[PDB]
Structures are given as C-alpha cells and as structure tokens.
Symmetry: C3
C-alpha cells in the first residue's frame, strides 16, 4: 500500500565525474543508498529506481532491494517518474517521489509526510520547508484552508510571492492511481521541452482534488547535492547529526569536528572516541571502549573494554578487554578473543586468537589458530602462501613461539611448546616439546683486530 | 588562611555514565583535576572535596592532594558544603566554593576573587559574569554601593530583573567562620527539599554583613559541563586557549583546530606542530623541534632540534637533533641520546640509545643499552622475555649488528663488533670480533627446470 | 619592461623567532616563495629581494630566481626600496613593490594591477581594498576623476576620512624611472626617523603626475602576517582557496577543513581525498585515485587508479592501479610499476618494483630492482649497507622470495626462482632455481614433560 520512486538518472554535470551523481558517497555510502534506507525505513514496501544509460553500477550497488526502470531521454521529472509505470501503474496506495541526491532525508520526515497525506485523504502532498534566502525556489502559496493553492516558480512570480519563505522541496506523496493518470496529461510546452512533475499538482487542483502541504522544520534535510562542495557540506551535516546523537547517548567524542561515524554504527555508553577516528559500515562498539586517535574501523565488532589505538580494522571481531595497536592491522576474518594483545606493527588476517593470546610486535598471523594464553614472539610469521595455495597453521595453548620464527604451513604446534628464536619450523611439534632449527654461534675474536 | 571546598558528588545524569561526572576528562585529565590545579594555583592551602557513594575512583585519582568529606544524601549545595565541617568548621580565613565540573576556571580569576574578597573585608563574595542570553540564571541585583542586593532566580523574578545580563556563577568566596555559622541556619522549605548555598548570602545580608560581587570578563571560564556535548565544548575552549598561548609565545601550529596540547605541556620557541598532533601529560618540548602530523606524545621530554614523525611516544626522553619515525613507538623508559635515528616500524622500550646510535627499521629494542654510533640492522630483536622474566642486552659502541639478528638476553656485544645478518646470538661477543650463526647457502640450479 | 621589489628584511618581532619573518611557511613553503611565484606568474622578468643582516637562509632558499640588495639599517620602506637602485635605477618600465609577508597575494591581482597602471600611463598605482573595520589603515581619498587624492593615515585623519572603508594595501606599481627619482626626495622628518614609501605618491601628485587606484575585491589576499596566529589564519585561508578549487574541478574531499593540499599539487578528476591527508611540494595525482586518511605525500607522482592508505610518500612514483599501505613508507627514489602491491609496515627506498610485483608486509627494499610479478615474502630484507657503502640487489621476474630472507647485496636472483623461508642469501642464484640457507628442524618431544 506504499511505494517509492527514486530519481537516479541525473547526469550531475557540475560533479565533473564519469560516475552517476547519486553514487558519490557521504559517510561511507552512496547518496542513493542513504535515500533508499530512509525510504524503506519509512514503511515503503516496493521501491522503483529510475536509471539512465550505463547504470550497471547503480543496479549493481543497490541490488535486489529495488526495481529498476530505464529513462532513455532526459525529458523532465514527470517523464522520469512515468518510466516506473511498468511496475506501478496498476497499484493502489501511496507513492512518494524522492531524488537520490538528497542524502540527509530522514525516515521520520518521510513517515510523517505519508501519515499527513493518508490522514487527509489527499491526492497529493508536497514536502515543504522554510528558508532564510528563498531566491530561486518554487514558493508555496497556501489557500484559505491551509492547503496548496499553487507552487510559483521564481521566473513567474510577483513581487509579493517572492517574499514567501516556504518553498517546495521537490519531494511529493501521491495517490498512486491519480499520479499515473495525471502523468499522461502533462505537456512539455516550455523552452526546455521537458515534462515537469509539479504540473501533476496543478492538474489535481484543477480537478477539485485535495493537495496538502507538509512542512519539515529541518531545511537541512532536503539538501540537494549538485557539486562536490555541496557533497562536502552533506558530509559535515551528517557528521554533526550522528556525533550529537552519540554524545547525548553517553559516548565521549573528544573532537566531533574531526570524528567520522557512519549512520549504521552503534556505540555503547562510556566509550571514548579520540580525534580523527573513522568508523563506518555496520559496526558495533560495546561499552567502556577506547578508540584511539586516527584509527579506521569498518564493518567490525568491538566488545566492551577493548582499546584500539591508531590502527586499521576491517571485517574483524575484537573480544572484551583486548588491546590492539598502535599501528596494527586487522584484516577480514581476524577474530580476537578476550584479553588478547595485538601490538605495534602486527597484521592479523583470517585468524582466530583465543583468550589471553599475545602477539606483541612485528608479526604476521594469517590463516591460523592461536590457542589460549600462547605467546607469539617478535618478528614471527605464519608462512601461509606458497605461490599457489594458502595453508593453515595451528598453535596450541600455553605455548611460547620465539622471536623471528617461521611457521611453514600446513603445520601444527602443540600445547605447552617452546619454539626457539630464529627457527624455521617445517614439521609438526607435539605437546610439551622444545623445537629448534638454527645454527649455533661462531665467535671470531679479534677477526676485526 | 585560605581553604577550598570542591563539590564532586554530582550524579551527572545527562552524562549517561557509570562514572562520576567530574572524572570525565578534558585535555587529557579529569575535570576535577583542572579545578584542583586552579584552586591550588590560586594560593589555597587546604582543599576539601565533597564525594558521594562509591567515590574510590575520585579519591584514588586525586590522592593525598585533597581531604575528603562524604555526602550520603543529595540535599543541595548548602548541605554538600556543610559536610566539610569536620575539616574546616573551626578554621579562620577565606574559603572558596567551586564545582568540580567547571574545568575552564582559571587561577587568575580565583586569585582576584580572593583578593577582592579580602581587600573588602567582606563576609562573602559572588563571582559573577555577563552573558548575552541570561535566561535561567540567577541575576545579580546590585545596591547603591555596588555591593550585592540579592540574587534573583528566574522563577521568582520581575520582568525588569529578567533583563539583567550579570548572573551568578555559583562560585563564592566566604569568611570561613561566617560560612559554617550560617550553614546551620539554612532551611529546605522548598519543593526540592534541598538546602541551597546562595541562601547563606541572604543570611549575611539580613545581618548587615558585607557581600561583594566580582565580575569576570571571561564568561567561558565559568562553564558548567552537564552532558557530553558540553564536554566537547570544553575541549574546544581549552584547545583554543592553549593553542593561542603557544602561537603568541613563538610556536608555529599549522592547524590549531586539529592540534591538541594539554595544559601541562611546555613548548620552546621556533617549534613547529603539524596537524593532528596530540601532546598531553607533563611534556617538555625544546626549541626548533618539529612534531610531525598525527603524532601522540604523553609525559615525555623532547630536546632541541628533534623531529618526531607520526609516532607514539610515552614516558620517554629524546635527545637533541634526534629523529623518530614515521610510524615508530617509544614506550615508557625509552631514552634516546643526541643525533640518534629511530626509523619506521621500530619499537623502543626501557632502553638507552647512546649518541649517534641508529635503529632504522623494523626492530624491537627492549631492556637494553645501545652504545654510541652503533648501527642496528633491519629486522633485529633484543630477545628480552623468556615467559618468566625479562633480561638485559648490552651492545657496545661503534658496532654493527646485521639484519634479522636475534640477541638472546642476557648477552653482551662488545665495541667495534660485527654480527652477521641472520644470526641468533646466545653467547657474549668480545670487542673487535665477528660473530655469525647461520647456515651457508645451497643453490639447486634447474631444480625448477 | 616589468620588475619587482620584494621587501624581506622585516625582523617580525611578534613572531618570537630566530629566523627571518618571510621564511616561515604556509602550505609547505616560505611566505616569500609564495610572493615570488605570484610576482613571476604576473609577468615580471627581474626580481630584487631586499634582505637584512644574516640573510643567507633567504638567499639560500630563493637561490638564483632573485637578485638581492642589502638593507643595513631599518630606516623605512622607502629606504628599503631604494637599496634596489644598484640593480634597477637605470631600468625602464613598470616596477611593483610587494612585501614578502603577504603569502595569499594572487598573480591575477598583480596582473590586473600592472595592466591598470600601464593602460592608464600612470606614474604610480595603489592596490586598494575595502574592509569592514578600517581602523588603523591608511584611507584612500579619491579625487573627482576617480584617481588618488591622498592616503590619509588614521593618526592624521578627520572624522569623515575615518569612515572610509577603502584602504591602502601597501602594494604599489610604479613607473620605474619616476620611482627612483622620487626616492631621493623622501625625507624622514618624523618621530620614527624613517623614510616612508607612500611619500613617493604625494611627490608625484605635487608634480601633476597620474596616480591611479586599483581595488581588489578580495581583501583576504592582501593579508600581512605579523605573528603566528596570523600565520595560522593564512594557512586556513590557503586551505579553503585550494580545496574549493579542487572540489569544483572534480575532486572529492571528504573533510576539507582537515585536508591540506599545497598550491603546486595537481589532482585529476574522480579522485577521493580522505580526511587528514597532507599533500605538498610538486605532486601530480591522476584520475580515480584514493588517498586514504592521514597520509602524507610530498613531491611525488601517483598514477590513475592508485590507492594510498595512511602512508608516507616522498619523492616517489606510483604506477597505475597500485596499492600502498596502510602504514607503508616510500622514500626518495621509490619507483612502483603498475598493479604493484606494497603492504603494511613496508619501506621502499631507491628501488624499482616492476609491474605486478608484491611486497605485502614487514619488509625493507633498498637500492634494488624487483622484476615483474615477483613475490617478496613477509619479513624479507635487501641488506644494502655494510657500514661503508651501499650495494645493489637484483631480483628477476616471476620469482618467489620466501619469508624472513636476507638478500646480502651485491647479489642477483634470477627469474622463476624460489628462495626458501629463513635464508640468508650471499651468492647469486640462476634462473629456475631453488635456494635455501637454513638449519633443519630438531624436535625434542617431552623435553618440557
Ligand atoms: C622480544 C620478544 O618478543 S621476547 C619473547 C620471545 N622469546 C624468545 O624468543 C625466547 C627464545 N629463547 C631461546 O631461543 C633460547 O635460546 C632457549 C630458550 C632455546 C635457551 O635454551 P636453554 O634451555 O636456555 O639452553 P640450552 O642450550 O641448554 O638448550 C636446551 C636444549 O636445546 C639444545 N640446543 C640449543 N641450541 C640448539 C641448536 N641451535 N640446535 C639444536 N639444539 C640446540 C641444547 O643442546 C639442549 O638440548 P639437550 O638438553 O638435548 O642437550
Ligand atoms: C637494510 C639494513 O639494515 S643494511 C645494515 C645491515 N647490514 C648488514 O646486515 C650487513 C651484514 N653482512 C653480512 O652478514 C655479510 O654476509 C658479511 C659481513 C658476514 C660478509 O663477510 P665477508 O667478510 O664479506 O665474507 P666471508 O665469507 O669471508 O666471511 C668472513 C669470515 O666469516 C666466515 N663465515 C662466513 N659465513 C659463515 C657462516 N655461515 N658460518 C660461519 N662462518 C662463516 C668465513 O669463513 C670467514 O671466516 P674465516 O676468515 O675464518 O675463513
Ligand atoms: C606470509 C607470507 O609472506 S607467505 C609468502 C612467502 N612464502 C614462503 O616463504 C614459502 C616458503 N616455503 C618454504 O620455505 C618451504 O619450506 C619449501 C618451499 C622450501 C618446501 O620445499 P618442499 O619442496 O615442499 O620440500 P623438500 O623438503 O622436498 O625441499 C625440496 C628440496 O630442498 C631440500 N631442502 C629442504 N630443506 C633444506 C635445508 N634446510 N637445507 C638444504 N636443503 C634443504 C630438500 O632436501 C630437497 O632437495 P633434494 O630434492 O635435492 O633432496
């Protein structure tokens, strides 16, 4: 009973880009995805996105979450909305029309837009907003009942109408049946040759139908990004929105102007975020965490009490009270247990570090399992790749792998094992063993007399 | 003759925190510590801090620098001040009352507050300030002599009094004897059931005693932090204060909005601080230093001419013209001499690097002494930990430790020694020696024909 | 036919510096260099810079691009300009006078200044600007023809003249012959004992010569840096100028307030610059590049499609679709081909990595050539320095150098070679070979029973 049409065919010429406008990112995700999530979060079931030539990247990114309709020619917004008729023309209920270049639109406003429309039994409802400098925008003229009288564009406005501060956002809610009926009645008798969607509204008005106006108190949210300066203004607007939310929810953010937290991040209370931190994707941070300065964390889970210092973390999990960094990298599939230590200049990839394990410096752990409380010395490497395949390394619990050791996978090191520093280990090592593979020392005294 | 009562029992509910409000940090230290230092710096000898249930962390952090008095119930500010009677009731002289959630309060203003109070022989003095939007604050009504007539709260203020821009800061100076006398005379005949400290002032007034008003020209400094948004505003205020001080003192700060220098840092002239740098604790930086972008330095000494590039430095000392980084870590007890080089991906901990020593890449030096002009090759490690104890490594002067060498401590390498690349060294090496511990090379030509 | 005199002898006492004022940097280069480039970019052929005692650093930095004249005493701006008479007194054409402490001056404004001067056949032209708060600056009084009547300093101005918003910038264009003629006629009959350059203008006026006024619409550009707070304001002004330019030219800048791009950097469209990035010197970045957060890039070339993540890059070249970082360092002379990978904690110096080569972690490559598609294992080192000289390493194509290998230069590894992990390689290795230099493994089962 609720549908949505997202306009994504814009060339965005001022972007000076080879990519479609709505694919440029804010807070780590394309603008069209922000709109999609606000639309879906508002209660819309079916979504159609209008695309242009060479829109594989748009369809590729949005995937199955949207239907698609192709606009071969740019003949205006009314024309673009009509291309969705294949999917929606015979549907009943509410349909909202939004542009994919308005990434700050909130689901709250779309919800209320739809509720206002439905509770009024309107044929169409305009999302409006009040701005300080209205120059250039279509002005809402209200009738005596508070409903829409007309949208006066500035090019055809008397001096009185020009003083109106309430403007059209270009976001509308329609009776779906009416919308597609009136779309066939729009003409392009103008200098651009285009079919303009607001014309539908005048058509409903000249038919005695109800056209409502709903005004949002947040004019920032209807921002339309047309160039990369505006793109950066959208980032700053989203930054302030999100950071204010987290601070009032119990997260300390030392410098919110320099801290970048995407919209799908959840952060528990009493957590401290230091300056420059960048947290994006679907990330969950527990209570009492410290994320240290200039870290980057994407699509990860960080449990309570953990400390991440100037590190890079992607698609990883970090258990309770675990310490990572400074200058460490957790790559996809890194899984650290509780009370683990991953020190400076350590890289972890597709590896499971059990509780209490310590990898304190200058090591690489890949395709590997490190048992509880095991110590991995400085300079040690899981040698996992042979130029053809990747092979697994297993280290048991309470073991001590010395410094500058190479574990040549596939290989298994038992529990309570000591591997001497400097050893290249090719053979499995049983529990409670000493393993050594290095030359003994020759000292040539006075060789340099 | 001068005492202070610091109110620290606030729950700070809007903080959404499990910790006491005054323990949250600005510029690297709890707000209550900022207040303590301003109080002590103003000439106050004895300090009492009022605490609540479970205040071990407050007492633990402030230690012996303060006495403590327990407030079992939250019955208002007058009640909280009274809990200090155990320590102060029979004392003579001036007593100032400040809240632990006002971290920007300066010692200069507290000094002048006390001097104004004493030079007037007042029984009490109110710190006031002038604000643009006075809504909500108690208004200072002055009498014909310029002294205090009454503090009108907004809830009980006529339309005239509401236009007053001068407000009460809630910071007072008292004759100590009078204060504790009048505290027993305060009632809680109000809707909150609380004993309010400003009531003491009206009591002195109705007794013919002198009540002065001292106005600070800096209304920022009386800021009371009640949530984490305000906490971030306090950080930005302290940032601007400190950075302006250093720039006018001869320090170049490339981007002061992104540079974080705590209040106990001293920086010599002609030093350059690059963007993102974070410097905290008791740190001393000499003249002609460059601190490069996104470094973190805490509780350290950096001598003249040194260069620190994107590195992490804690509890360390760096001698003149020494170069550190990019991406190096100096851990507690790292001591670098003059003209030393510590290169990328090097970690130094509890180690003494004498003048001219070079550790240029991918090395770990712990619990060790490196002599003058000695070169430590890439990938080399002091193997200091055996899973039970830590052991020391000594390297002499003018020595050359090759790449990927493991020094298995305890071990001593003499002067003018060469250790061949790839050696695990277990035995002491005398002066002017060659030491080698590695396999010779086998070449299997056409093995991969 | 066009000359320039740059005043660089200022002590800049408020700088609290041991260095000359105009040598302090904005956007990675001394203020006097910014002025020089604007001057040269305006069509000026001959440049004279006026210097003081101990100006070796000024001459050293600006080199042969400028002539030099020495000002022994600070007797005013007219005196300073006169010291250029040795080089210019007998020249014909236009001469502009600018200060070396005005780093935001644009070549566009200097061009138009010169064109206005020449097209008017003026004897002198004043660069003016309109400011909101004119207090303190000399005011332009225009005559009935629009030409200059007089510059009224505030100390000698009637209440009317004080309301003028148009002020003198202190930047002038002169008929070169007139300028040096009138310089001998300036007196120092004032409280400072100084010869003031604007006096030349009154001399031309009292002779019936034409004195024009050209007003720039950008009052920011005439900013004179007198202390380090103002120095930081110049950095922010240049930051906003440059970042706006790149955004409107098709570069996405995620946080332009925290992104620092020098004026000699060129960046191709569809490139993304993440927060904290610092790019300086003569750097060329191609299209479709990602520069990741908190990177530093100086004097380098980055080709299309490359990705640089939190890394330090100096005097290096990076080929198309090559990936660098996080936490890597490219040092002078690093040359990476196309589709190369340089992973975390890798250092490259004076080394050529051919197309497809991979150095993925914890390695050092110096003075070396790495052939196409060759894989350098983790922990591997080109051992290039012997404490006396540096020696070269050659690795062929399609080779596999195992982990923790030391290549002791000079040494040559052939094509399709495998070097076993843990090997110290001292001898050349022919094509299609296996090379190994490590101890075999001893396993002492139950040694730790
Ligand atoms: C910075 C950090 O990360 S610190 C954390 C990392 N910690 C480490 O790397 C510690 C590593 N320590 C070592 O490698 C030490 O040299 C140790 C533990 C092997 C010393 O062994 P110790 O027991 O002290 O000495 P010892 O010489 O008796 O060695 C024990 C056995 O190994 C044998 N052995 C010693 N060296 C060798 C060798 N090169 N080849 C073969 N066997 C050897 C001894 O002969 C003895 O065997 P046996 O009892 O059958 O005769
Ligand atoms: C990237 C950076 O950090 S660069 C800075 C680090 N620099 C280094 O690591 C440089 C290290 N260099 C090396 O290890 C070299 O291989 C060197 C210095 C040992 C070369 O030694 P050279 O003198 O050139 O050669 P040579 O083979 O003659 O070695 C000298 C002695 O060592 C002996 N020797 C050589 N290899 C071995 C070995 N594996 N085991 C035992 N003895 C050996 C030789 O037999 C000779 O002894 P002798 O005179 O009694 O016969
Ligand atoms: C994390 C990363 O960066 S992963 C990417 C890096 N990858 C690597 O480092 C992989 C390195 N792999 C290795 O070093 C392995 O141990 C390999 C490739 C040498 C294994 O060799 P394999 O062919 O599997 O085994 P094998 O034991 O048969 O060795 C082949 C030959 O070397 C010989 N050999 C093995 N070890 C030694 C040794 N220590 N000394 C001398 N010769 C040796 C064997 O005797 C055999 O020779 P032969 O045919 O004449 O008898």
């Amino acid at each position: 009973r609720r549908h949505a049409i997202i306009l994504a065919a814009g060339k965005g010429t001022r972007m000076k880009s080879k990519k479609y406008k709505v694919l440029h990112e804010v807070a780590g995700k394309p603008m069209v995805e922000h709109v999609l999530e606000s639309v879906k979060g508002s209660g819309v079931d079916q979504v159609v996105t209008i695309v242009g030539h060479g829109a594989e990247s748009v369809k590729g990114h949005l995937g199955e979450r949207s239907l698609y309709s192709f606009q071969e020619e740019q003949l205006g917004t009314a024309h673009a909305v009509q291309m969705a008729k294949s999917h929606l023309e015979d549907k009943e209920g509410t349909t909202i029309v939004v542009c994919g270049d308005t990434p700050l639109i909130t689901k709250e406003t779309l919800v209320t837009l739809i509720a206002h429309h439905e509770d009024a039994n309107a044929q169409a409802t305009v999302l409006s907003a009040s701005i300080q400098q209205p120059y250039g925008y279509g002005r809402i003229v209200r009738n005596a009942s508070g409903r829409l009288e007309r949208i006066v564009e500035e090019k055809d406005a008397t001096q009185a109408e020009k003083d109106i501060n309430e403007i059209s956002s270009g976001i509308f809610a329609f009776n779906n049946k009416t919308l597609f009926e009136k779309l066939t009645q729009v003409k392009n008798d103008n200098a651009q040759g285009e079919y303009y969607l607001p014309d539908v509204l005048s058509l409903i008005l000249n038919d005695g139908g109800i056209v409502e106006v709903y005004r949002t108190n947040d004019v920032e949210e209807i921002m339309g990004v047309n160039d990369r300066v505006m793109l950066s203004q959208a980032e700053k607007a989203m930054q302030r929105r999100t950071n204010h939310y987290h601070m009032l929810n119990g997260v300390t953010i030392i410098d919110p102007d320099s801290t970048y937290i995407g919209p799908d991040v959840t952060i528990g209370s009493d957590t401290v975020i230091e300056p420059g931190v960048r947290i994006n994707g679907r990330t969950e941070i527990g209570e009492d965490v410290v994320i240290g300065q200039y870290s980057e964390i994407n699509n990860s889970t960080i449990e309570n009490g953990a400390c991440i210092q100037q590190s890079v973390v992607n698609d990883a999990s970090v258990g309770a009270n675990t310490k990572v960094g400074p200058f460490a990298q957790l790559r996809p599939g890194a899984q650290l247990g509780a009370d683990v230590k991953v020190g400076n200049f350590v890289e972890i990839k597709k590896a499971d570090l059990k509780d209490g394990a310590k990898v304190s410096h200058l090591s690489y752990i890949g395709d590997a399992v490190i048992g509880e409380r095991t110590n991995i010395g400085c300079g040690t490497i899981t040698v996992n790749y042979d130029g053809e395949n990747k092979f697994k390394t297993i280290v048991g619990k309470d073991s001590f792998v010395g410094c500058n050791v190479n574990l040549v996978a596939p290989v298994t090191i038992g529990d309570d094992v000591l591997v001497a520093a400097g050893s290249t280990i090719t053979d499995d090592v049983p529990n409670d063993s000493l393993a050594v593979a290095r030359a003994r020392q020759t000292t040539k005294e006075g060789y340099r007399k």
